[PDB]
Amino acid sequence: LKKKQIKLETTQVSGNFGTKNSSGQIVTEGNSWSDYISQIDSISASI
Amino acid sequence: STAVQDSNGESWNTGLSINKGESAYINANVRYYNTGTAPMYKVTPTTNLVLDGDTLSTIKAQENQIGNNLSPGDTYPKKGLSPLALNTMDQFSSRLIPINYDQLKKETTQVSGNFGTKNSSGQIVTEGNSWSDYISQIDSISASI
Amino acid sequence: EHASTDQGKTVSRATTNSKTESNTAGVSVNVGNVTTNYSHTTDNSTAVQDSNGESWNTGLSINKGESAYINANVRYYNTGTAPMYKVTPTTNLVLDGDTLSTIKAQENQIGNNLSPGDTYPKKGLSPLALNTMDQFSSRLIPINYDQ
Amino acid sequence: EHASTDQGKTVSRATTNSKTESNTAGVSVNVGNVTTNYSHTTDN
Numbered sequence A: 001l002k003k004k005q006i007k008l009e010t011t012q013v014s015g016n017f018g019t020k021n022s023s024g025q026i027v028t029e030g031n032s033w034s035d036y037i038s039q040i041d042s043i044s045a046s047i
Numbered sequence B: 001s002t003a004v005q006d007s008n009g010e011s012w013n014t015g016l017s018i019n020k021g022e023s024a025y026i027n028a029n030v031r032y033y034n035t036g037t038a039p040m041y042k043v044t045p046t047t048n049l050v051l052d053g054d055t056l057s058t059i060k061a062q063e064n065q066i067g068n069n070l071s072p073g074d075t076y077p078k079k080g081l082s083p084l085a086l087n088t089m090d091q092f093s094s095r096l097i098p099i100n101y102d103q104l105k106k107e108t109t110q111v112s113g114n115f116g117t118k119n120s121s122g123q124i125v126t127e128g129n130s131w132s133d134y135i136s137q138i139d140s141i142s143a144s145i
Numbered sequence C: 001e002h003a004s005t006d007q008g009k010t011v012s013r014a015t016t017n018s019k020t021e022s023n024t025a026g027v028s029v030n031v032g033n034v035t036t037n038y039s040h041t042t043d044n045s046t047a048v049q050d051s052n053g054e055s056w057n058t059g060l061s062i063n064k065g066e067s068a069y070i071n072a073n074v075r076y077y078n079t080g081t082a083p084m085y086k087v088t089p090t091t092n093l094v095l096d097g098d099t100l101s102t103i104k105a106q107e108n109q110i111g112n113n114l115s116p117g118d119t120y121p122k123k124g125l126s127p128l129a130l131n132t133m134d135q136f137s138s139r140l141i142p143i144n145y146d147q
Numbered sequence D: 001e002h003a004s005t006d007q008g009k010t011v012s013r014a015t016t017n018s019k020t021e022s023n024t025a026g027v028s029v030n031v032g033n034v035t036t037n038y039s040h041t042t043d044n
Helices: A034-043 B132-141
Strands: B002-011 B014-019 B041-042 B046-050 B055-060 B066-069 C002-023 C027-029 C035-053 C058-064 C072-074 C084-087 C090-092 C099-105 C109-112 C129-130 D003-008 D010-031 D032-036 D038-044
Touching: A034 B041, A034 B066, B046 D032, B055 C129, B132 C084, B132 C109, C072 D010
Parallel strands: none
Antiparallel strands: B002 C002, B014 C002, B041 B066, B046 B055, C002 C035, C002 C058, C027 C035, C035 D010, C058 D003, C072 C129, C084 C109, C090 C099, D010 D032, D010 D038
16 A cells, blocks of 8 residues: 556456347347457457 | 642553464466467466465466466467456455465466357357366377477 | 454653641640640642553454364375266365364366376376365365364 | 453553642640740752
8 A cells, every 4th residue: 555557457358249139139148259359360460 | 638639641552463364365466378279268277376285275266367268379468468366266256365374474277168169150159168078088099299 | 363462652741739737736744844735737749750651462362163274185086987077076074083064165176177097186286275165165164172 | 152361561660759848837835934936848
């Protein structure tokens, strides 16, 4: 308690996306981005 | 004889009490790494913690120290950041890691995670894909290089 | 255990005033002439004290119920033909003849996989730690006072 | 149960000064001659 900015650091950000299940309905449950992330950066480039 | 006294004083007191059982709380700063061929998802390492020869405790890290994804050759946290914090010991992240009174004078086992397959389309799923199943099969039919 | 020390300085100034009145009266006789008297005395007394002390105190309190917390260091092993996955051994803990408690280890002391002839932890490491007793890994294993 | 022991040394120095003033006065008589006096005393 006696004590640039290193307080705020941000690692992985788990979340979900949305697809259609059987109609024009949208669902978010089960759509973790965290799965496709690791695939992408190794087959892509960051700009 | 009539006599009258009027005293007035001021006291000080500095106290210190200690729990020989929970005498301090541990907090680690760790960096995960992967050397093999496959990416691991939802990384959860169990952590043997040894002082002299004995083991302070063992932490199967909870959702806080967890690792979402770990490409081969990458690290968690990734190359740019500082190591993360393993602050607690039980399955809800409430109680920090304790040590004995005489302890204060003074390792990585299994790493449960998941992989990814396709269910009915070009979709990928990680749920239910524990690596821990296929591991024991492999090392007995293979060799380490 | 619970240990504690308590140390603290003290300082106390104290003044006191006093007035004492004294009326006496004596009666004497020389035989072989009589003499009598009576005196009167008035004294006002100012006095001042200044004490200062320092105390020490070392305390120790104990719970005869939860008098210590147990922590094991264990090594699993398998001798049979089949690999076991998600290994969870229940552990009878005996002091004299009785049983301290029984721990169905939780996710922390669990074992992911155990090939036949292998151990957990495997051959290279040191034994792991069974630190707690209930299903969330929060409360260490207790014993009696006379235990 | 909950058991506890508490033991601790104490030390207290204490000085005191005092000044007492004393004015007395007596009256005597020898019958068969009168004598009177009054003293004054100062003690620190």
